[PDB]
Write a protein that binds this ligand. Sequence first.
Ligand code: HEM
Ligand code: HEM
Ligand SMILES: Cc1cc(N)nc(C[C@@H]2CNC[C@@H]2OCCCCOc2cc(F)cc(Cl)c2)c1
Ligand SMILES: Cc1cc(N)nc(C[C@@H]2CNC[C@@H]2OCCCCOc2cc(F)cc(Cl)c2)c1
Ligand SMILES: C[C@H](O)[C@H](O)[C@H]1CNc2nc(N)[nH]c(=O)c2N1
Ligand SMILES: C[C@H](O)[C@H](O)[C@H]1CNc2nc(N)[nH]c(=O)c2N1
Ligand SMILES: [Zn+2]
Lengths: 407, 411
Amino acid sequence: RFLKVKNWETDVVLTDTLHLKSTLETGCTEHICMGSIMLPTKDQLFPLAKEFLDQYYSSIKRFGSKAHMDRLEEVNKEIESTSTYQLKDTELIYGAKHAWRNASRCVGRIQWSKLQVFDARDCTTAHGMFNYICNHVKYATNKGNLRSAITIFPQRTDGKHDFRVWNSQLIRYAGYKQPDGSTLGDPANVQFTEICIQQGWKAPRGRFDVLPLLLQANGNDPELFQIPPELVLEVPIRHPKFDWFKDLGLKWYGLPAVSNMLLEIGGLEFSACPFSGWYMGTEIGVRDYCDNSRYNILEEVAKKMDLDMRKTSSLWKDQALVEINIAVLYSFQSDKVTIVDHHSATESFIKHMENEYRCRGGCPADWVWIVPPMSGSITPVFHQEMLNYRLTPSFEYQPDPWNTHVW
Amino acid sequence: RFLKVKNWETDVVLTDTLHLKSTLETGCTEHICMGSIMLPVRTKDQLFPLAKEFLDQYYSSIKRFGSKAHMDRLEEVNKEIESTSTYQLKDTELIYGAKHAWRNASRCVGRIQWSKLQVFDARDCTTAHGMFNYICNHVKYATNKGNLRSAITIFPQRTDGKHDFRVWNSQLIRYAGYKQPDGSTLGDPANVQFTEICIQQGWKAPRGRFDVLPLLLQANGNDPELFQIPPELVLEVPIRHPKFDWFKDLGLKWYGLPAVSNMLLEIGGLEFSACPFSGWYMGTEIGVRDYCDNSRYNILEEVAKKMDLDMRKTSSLWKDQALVEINIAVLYSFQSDKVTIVDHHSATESFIKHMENEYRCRGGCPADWVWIVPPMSGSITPVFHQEMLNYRLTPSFEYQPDPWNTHVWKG
Ligand code: HEM
Ligand code: HEM
Ligand SMILES: Cc1cc(N)nc(C[C@@H]2CNC[C@@H]2OCCCCOc2cc(F)cc(Cl)c2)c1
Ligand SMILES: Cc1cc(N)nc(C[C@@H]2CNC[C@@H]2OCCCCOc2cc(F)cc(Cl)c2)c1
Ligand SMILES: C[C@H](O)[C@H](O)[C@H]1CNc2nc(N)[nH]c(=O)c2N1
Ligand SMILES: C[C@H](O)[C@H](O)[C@H]1CNc2nc(N)[nH]c(=O)c2N1
Ligand SMILES: [Zn+2]
């Protein structure tokens, strides 16, 4: 019930108490561990609200004050007559900041407290959503000096009037099925590309086609919008020693911006709440470029390096993987667009973790997502035990909305 | 109750029923996942059910479940337990048991090999010297002049927990580590404490960077005794790089035989506290872990220096670049000397085919993703994208505390 985590490279032991305030379920039992599964009324709403306001008022050093009790009352009365309630601004900011503080999969949480929150709760149409979004993108991009941010659309009401961003990320490249039967562009987005084309998008039918936004206001059918090209900062990818690298025609976008999650604060659900930070190199260089199911360019790169591709044991995939990632890092840096490498990101999180242990009594952390997808055991997170548990406020993953929306 | 695992790369969906036969606890609950925690005298009473569970498993596997031969053996074990407190495994059962402990080892990527396992029965061994002989024979048989064969040697079972057989070495073959007065370390820093116990026990230590440790051997609850493995039995590979010629002058070598000797084998309720086993290396174990862990031989800097990488910012990926070359070197070296080795690409791929076979034939394959994914290049190996369920089946191998923490010195 008080739990220890050991770092096996340093012998630092941390004691976790924070887990006891754990509320949601993990998917694990004492019989089966699900650590590597990607997806494991007025009545219920008041405890949730209470649990949240309690932590808020504690955080502002006013637990059990006149102002604390007064708010519990007001919220309680609002639920009883309206069946929901509204967060104060200051509460909203705190909820969003803490949702990221609680995100057990996120290696970049050292920054959780620097999050600019944009209150789009007064939003009513897809056009409003687009406007808010363009502002988010421009503010966050900051000409390349990236700033973390989240934009929060109106909370779920009765589930029939949800605001949703249909894209999974604000900025993503189109994927298209080809005559030969292979894939042009990003295969991750085939399904969504076709929907866009089917909503009406004039697809340029290229390899790095920035997709249109699909915006749903008040549970209405969604509409398309192109993001002003001048707002989409992109980076052409070159190697600091391989001259031919640039001839591959590779580019990536500077702004990672998750747009499909559901944000839960004090029992209220914000179903459209797109957020953005900045890339860790490996997310582009390892996953976007190299995954079998993604742009998958290892064979092409390995050939240009004239490596021995006859046997897996020449470690040609590995050698090419490193060079691809040097190139991502080098390009972003050369163009002055913020990026971090896995070494410094993981070093940063270790410091963050130790901060959260002395300041908060722990830090939920999912080791399967925290350890980088290349060079695992030479980053310090590999040797660090982590406890994974669900705390609220949180971000949850949610069903791709076309399986869920009626047309 | 059915459970599905998905492969995100292939979209193959597998159904696990096997987890229904799981008994030991994981350490996880519905409130907390312990999946990355390294570590998350028996009684007459609990024993016959454990025996019976095991023996029903054995008899189903040979297609004699319900046979007279099965019921006779149940009653026979029954009796033996009540009159003597324990029981003895037949040869056939011991072999089956040791194969299934490997089969159920959810952290092992090598399990495609599980049915090929040479079992050596050392249950007549009564002394340390006797243990040494048996271990020497194991090492010679498994080494096989470079053409490694999987094997395990099984020493007599625990009785009252006061007469335990133990190999104090954590692997049969490992290098010493010596802490210097100045805080540096010569040899393997993992093995420094154990090396101190050996020096203390009387070992004369050459004090260099790759000294093979002496076995420390405990028979029958007795104080352990020192023994030198015959050096002609210790196959070693000097490490060189196919393109870089300065690599060999780093002075590096490694032993060919990976052989775990500190674990506990449990079969039908019995505890074998001494069951050293051995297979062959996956190259990243030496390349990534042994050489490049910071707490081990820590050679990334020296290798990047000699490679003249830009070492002034981590974003050159100098560590990553040096790591690949070392790993190329280890696989090159083993292969040139005809010592069995598998790379991580080929080992993970075999494992996914093993894993799928197991779902079709057995109803599951428990697997610990945190351990199965190699410690480099994780995401370009197909295990990365594989969902896995982790659960504890017996027969099983178990960590046991280092013996020098528990032994009462007879003096
Ligand atoms: C400041 C720079 C940031 C870095 C370097 C970063 C790092 C990452 C990384 C590497 C992942 C794994 C992504 C994957 O492999 O799919 C991740 C996941 C995630 N991060 Fe961050 N993050 C940053 C900012 C943010 C911000 C601003 C938020 C929200 C406010 C956030 C919330 C999340 C969440 C909820 C996940 C899990 C996503 C999922 O489950 O699909 N991160 N983070
Ligand atoms: C074909 C040769 C084999 C290969 C390539 C292989 C591969 C591996 C690797 C890479 C590990 C992880 C070690 C680490 O990174 O800490 C491992 C763990 C393990 N393997 Fe194997 N294995 C092989 C044969 C065997 C055999 C013969 C057995 C026993 C019969 C066995 C049982 C285990 C156990 C119990 C663990 C976990 C050890 C622990 O918890 O410390 N393996 N396997
Ligand atoms: C089925 C499913 C569940 C889930 N939680 N998330 C997904 C999305 C998959 C999981 N990894 C790749 C893909 O996610 C990419 C979007 C997350 C990227 O997250 C960030 C956010 C940042 F701000 C910065 C960085 Cl480097 C990464 C799918
Ligand atoms: C605290 C703890 C628990 C535990 N279960 N196991 C350990 C042993 C640790 C895990 N990494 C370093 C040390 O491993 C050496 C033992 C595993 C090696 O196993 C094999 C066996 C083989 F036949 C082949 C290969 Cl590549 C590896 C420590
Ligand atoms: C099956 C496994 O859970 C899955 O492949 C995970 C592994 N770790 C990950 N780690 C990160 N950061 N992102 C991911 O998408 C994944 N995928
Ligand atoms: C803390 C963490 O669980 C621990 O470092 C694990 C991570 N994965 C590993 N995987 C293997 N194969 N071997 C190990 O020693 C470890 N160490
Ligand atoms: Zn778990």
